[PDB]
Design an enzyme around this catalytic site. Structure first.
Site, PDB file in Angstrom:
ATOM      1  N   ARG A  38      16.384 -73.610  43.408  1.00 16.51           N
ATOM      2  CA  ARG A  38      16.827 -74.749  43.311  1.00 16.51           C
ATOM      3  C   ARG A  38      17.249 -75.026  45.246  1.00 16.51           C
ATOM      4  O   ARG A  38      16.966 -76.585  45.980  1.00 16.51           O
ATOM      5  CB  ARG A  38      17.125 -75.066  42.356  1.00 16.51           C
ATOM      6  CG  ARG A  38      17.861 -76.756  42.244  1.00 16.51           C
ATOM      7  CD  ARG A  38      18.751 -77.509  41.702  1.00 16.51           C
ATOM      8  NE  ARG A  38      19.432 -79.147  41.785  1.00 16.51           N
ATOM      9  CZ  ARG A  38      20.215 -80.028  41.683  1.00 16.51           C
ATOM     10  NH1 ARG A  38      21.717 -78.923  41.717  1.00 16.51           N
ATOM     11  NH2 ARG A  38      20.507 -81.359  42.007  1.00 16.51           N
ATOM     12  N   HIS A  42      16.621 -77.104  48.523  1.00 16.90           N
ATOM     13  CA  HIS A  42      17.224 -78.288  48.634  1.00 16.90           C
ATOM     14  C   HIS A  42      17.183 -77.975  50.177  1.00 16.90           C
ATOM     15  O   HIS A  42      17.420 -78.959  51.064  1.00 16.90           O
ATOM     16  CB  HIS A  42      18.340 -78.058  48.298  1.00 16.90           C
ATOM     17  CG  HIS A  42      18.150 -78.995  46.755  1.00 16.90           C
ATOM     18  ND1 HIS A  42      19.844 -79.790  46.452  1.00 16.90           N
ATOM     19  CD2 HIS A  42      17.641 -79.726  46.210  1.00 16.90           C
ATOM     20  CE1 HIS A  42      19.274 -80.874  45.478  1.00 16.90           C
ATOM     21  NE2 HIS A  42      18.098 -79.908  44.814  1.00 16.90           N
ATOM     22  N   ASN A  70      23.773 -82.477  45.912  1.00 19.30           N
ATOM     23  CA  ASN A  70      24.704 -80.927  46.083  1.00 19.30           C
ATOM     24  C   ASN A  70      25.172 -81.079  45.335  1.00 19.30           C
ATOM     25  O   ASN A  70      26.036 -79.739  44.397  1.00 19.30           O
ATOM     26  CB  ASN A  70      24.731 -80.361  47.297  1.00 19.30           C
ATOM     27  CG  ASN A  70      23.065 -80.132  47.588  1.00 19.30           C
ATOM     28  OD1 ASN A  70      22.127 -79.350  47.453  1.00 19.30           O
ATOM     29  ND2 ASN A  70      22.748 -80.895  48.863  1.00 19.30           N
ATOM     30  N   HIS A 170      11.429 -77.315  36.958  1.00 19.83           N
ATOM     31  CA  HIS A 170      12.210 -77.455  35.385  1.00 19.83           C
ATOM     32  C   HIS A 170      11.498 -76.369  34.497  1.00 19.83           C
ATOM     33  O   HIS A 170      12.496 -77.415  32.722  1.00 19.83           O
ATOM     34  CB  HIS A 170      11.984 -78.985  35.696  1.00 19.83           C
ATOM     35  CG  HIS A 170      12.602 -79.624  36.475  1.00 19.83           C
ATOM     36  ND1 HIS A 170      13.151 -81.063  36.670  1.00 19.83           N
ATOM     37  CD2 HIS A 170      13.497 -79.821  37.566  1.00 19.83           C
ATOM     38  CE1 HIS A 170      13.478 -81.526  38.392  1.00 19.83           C
ATOM     39  NE2 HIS A 170      14.125 -80.523  38.380  1.00 19.83           N
TER      40      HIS A 170
HETATM   41  C1  HEM Z   1      10.563 -84.528  42.272  1.00 21.16           C
HETATM   42  C2  HEM Z   1      12.074 -85.121  41.759  1.00 21.16           C
HETATM   43  C3  HEM Z   1      13.422 -83.583  41.912  1.00 21.16           C
HETATM   44  C4  HEM Z   1      14.470 -84.383  40.981  1.00 21.16           C
HETATM   45  C5  HEM Z   1      14.492 -85.882  41.407  1.00 21.16           C
HETATM   46  C6  HEM Z   1      14.816 -83.023  40.521  1.00 21.16           C
HETATM   47  C7  HEM Z   1      16.513 -83.612  40.045  1.00 21.16           C
HETATM   48  C8  HEM Z   1      17.248 -82.658  39.034  1.00 21.16           C
HETATM   49  C9  HEM Z   1      18.331 -82.426  38.699  1.00 21.16           C
HETATM   50  C10 HEM Z   1      18.656 -84.196  37.942  1.00 21.16           C
HETATM   51  C11 HEM Z   1      18.921 -81.619  37.836  1.00 21.16           C
HETATM   52  C12 HEM Z   1      19.924 -81.372  37.486  1.00 21.16           C
HETATM   53  C13 HEM Z   1      21.267 -81.295  39.101  1.00 21.16           C
HETATM   54  C14 HEM Z   1      22.677 -80.530  38.476  1.00 21.16           C
HETATM   55  O1  HEM Z   1      22.924 -81.410  36.587  1.00 21.16           O
HETATM   56  O2  HEM Z   1      23.427 -80.608  38.836  1.00 21.16           O
HETATM   57  C15 HEM Z   1      17.723 -80.510  38.578  1.00 21.16           C
HETATM   58  C16 HEM Z   1      18.101 -79.203  38.017  1.00 21.16           C
HETATM   59  C17 HEM Z   1      16.729 -78.154  39.200  1.00 21.16           C
HETATM   60  N1  HEM Z   1      15.640 -78.406  39.732  1.00 21.16           N
HETATM   61 FE1  HEM Z   1      15.139 -79.956  39.937  1.00 21.16          FE
HETATM   62  N2  HEM Z   1      14.228 -82.085  41.021  1.00 21.16           N
HETATM   63  C18 HEM Z   1      12.858 -82.359  41.495  1.00 21.16           C
HETATM   64  C19 HEM Z   1      11.968 -81.259  42.077  1.00 21.16           C
HETATM   65  C20 HEM Z   1      12.819 -79.749  41.795  1.00 21.16           C
HETATM   66  C21 HEM Z   1      11.410 -78.938  42.589  1.00 21.16           C
HETATM   67  C22 HEM Z   1      10.689 -79.139  43.286  1.00 21.16           C
HETATM   68  C23 HEM Z   1      12.560 -77.974  42.215  1.00 21.16           C
HETATM   69  C24 HEM Z   1      11.994 -76.544  42.242  1.00 21.16           C
HETATM   70  C25 HEM Z   1      11.096 -76.213  43.189  1.00 21.16           C
HETATM   71  C26 HEM Z   1      13.283 -77.994  41.419  1.00 21.16           C
HETATM   72  C27 HEM Z   1      13.986 -76.962  40.578  1.00 21.16           C
HETATM   73  C28 HEM Z   1      15.539 -77.055  40.274  1.00 21.16           C
HETATM   74  C29 HEM Z   1      15.744 -76.161  39.252  1.00 21.16           C
HETATM   75  C30 HEM Z   1      15.663 -74.714  39.567  1.00 21.16           C
HETATM   76  C31 HEM Z   1      17.088 -76.757  38.215  1.00 21.16           C
HETATM   77  C32 HEM Z   1      17.991 -76.670  37.510  1.00 21.16           C
HETATM   78  C33 HEM Z   1      19.037 -75.637  38.817  1.00 21.16           C
HETATM   79  C34 HEM Z   1      19.775 -74.902  37.424  1.00 21.16           C
HETATM   80  O3  HEM Z   1      20.029 -74.607  36.256  1.00 21.16           O
HETATM   81  O4  HEM Z   1      21.174 -74.052  37.831  1.00 21.16           O
HETATM   82  N3  HEM Z   1      13.463 -79.385  41.664  1.00 21.16           N
HETATM   83  N4  HEM Z   1      17.079 -81.574  39.343  1.00 21.16           N
HETATM   84 CA   LIG Z   2      17.317 -77.189  55.200  1.00 18.22          CA
END
Ligand code: HEM
Ligand SMILES: [Ca+2]
Ligand SMILES: [Ca+2]
Length: 306
Positions: A38, A42, A70, A170
């Site tokens: 993630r 970002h 973030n 995800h």
């Molecule tokens: C396309 C719309 C996207 C949205 C709206 C979104 C939204 C989110 C949100 C709300 C969370 C939880 C944050 C938290 O609870 O602190 C999250 C976690 C995560 N996101 Fe997404 N995301 C998107 C795209 C992506 C992409 C493109 C990737 C990787 C290529 C990604 C990888 C991750 C991962 C791996 C986590 C888990 C992080 C952890 O457990 O520390 N996301 N995302």
């Molecule tokens: Ca950058």
């Protein structure tokens, strides 16, 4: 042009040092591989993959760490510091923070069971961080499919395959209750749940995330295999079991004519998904890099060199 052989003479064991660092951290934090992927996402979505996200505050610019996407969310920064110190020890002043984070993301995916590939390398590190740009560019979980598509297009990823494949991130990791409360209790000011959320899963999620409960409580993105990098994410979507609104939109949006067949193809074939994921990751890793003599090889990922 970025190239996977960039450090083959100057720091040939770089991916190994990165791997061992993650392997070690995973023993006490099983979430770290998700968190690192993630971080790279970002980084890339804000001025490109230039390690701008790793910078701390200065008196002239604010850190991206205080962005809405973030703050109290992004994590893993000290692990990046640790692999950075280890690489600097092996290969002084050689490997950029931007590249290090890119390798870290790839190694994290592989360590969690996903595809294995060599990322293009040669990125250099930013001379500033971009808080406002991070607030503008990182998509939010309440985005509609057209908004998600706009958000990817805004950074140079035009293809619906980019969006659907990178969404496969995800397949592991955690999400706070705060981001799904509306789906559970008051979706789009109806006082009713999101009708595209499977009603059995709705009950489970309400149990984890009660109205008036702890908004920071964490729930798994992938109810099938919460820590394994695989295509089970997409099977969830086909069952109306995407966790965040933006997940389920890939399959259920009125605008999903182009994304539905991608979701299905990735649910049907691990190989199809993994191929598309690597392709999309490399496209994301190619977002507006600094190269050659542009920017720095930063020695401490948190501060510009002086
Ligand atoms: C396309 C719309 C996207 C949205 C709206 C979104 C939204 C989110 C949100 C709300 C969370 C939880 C944050 C938290 O609870 O602190 C999250 C976690 C995560 N996101 Fe997404 N995301 C998107 C795209 C992506 C992409 C493109 C990737 C990787 C290529 C990604 C990888 C991750 C991962 C791996 C986590 C888990 C992080 C952890 O457990 O520390 N996301 N995302
Ligand atoms: Ca950058
Ligand atoms: Ca999974």
């Amino acid at each position: 042009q970025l190239t996977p052989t960039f450090y083959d003479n100057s720091c040939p064991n770089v991916s190994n040092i990165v791997r061992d660092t993650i392997v070690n951290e995973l023993r006490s934090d099983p979430r770290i591989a998700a968190s690192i992927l993630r971080l790279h996402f970002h980084d890339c979505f804000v001025n490109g993959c230039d390690a701008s996200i790793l910078l701390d505050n200065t008196t002239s610019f604010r850190t991206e760490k205080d962005a809405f996407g973030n703050a109290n969310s992004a994590r893993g920064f000290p692990v990046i510091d640790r692999m950075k110190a280890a690489v600097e020890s092996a290969c002084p002043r050689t490997v950029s923070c931007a590249d290090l984070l890119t390798i870290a993301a790839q190694q994290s995916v592989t360590l969690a069971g996903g595809p294995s590939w060599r990322v293009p390398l040669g990125r250099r590190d930013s001379l500033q961080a971009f808080l406002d740009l991070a607030n503008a560019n990182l998509p939010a979980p309440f985005f509609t499919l057209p908004q998600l598509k706009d958000s990817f297009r805004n950074v140079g990823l035009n293809r619906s395959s980019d969006l659907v494949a990178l969404y496969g991130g995800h397949t592991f990791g955690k999400n706070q209750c705060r981001f799904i409360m509306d789906r559970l209790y008051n979706f789009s000011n109806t006082g009713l749940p999101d009708p595209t959320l499977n009603t059995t899963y709705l009950q489970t999620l309400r149990g984890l995330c009660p109205l008036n409960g702890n908004l920071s409580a964490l729930v798994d993105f992938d109810l099938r295999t919460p820590t394994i990098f695989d295509n089970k994410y997409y099977v969830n979507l086909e069952e109306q079991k995407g966790l965040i609104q933006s997940d389920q939109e890939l399959f259920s949006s009125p605008n999903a004519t182009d994304t539905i067949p991608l979701v299905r193809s990735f649910a049907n074939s691990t190989q199809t998904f993994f191929n598309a994921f690597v392709e999309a990751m490399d496209r994301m890793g190619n977002i507006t890099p600094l190269t050659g003599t542009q920017g720095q090889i930063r020695l401490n990922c948190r501060v510009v060199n002086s």
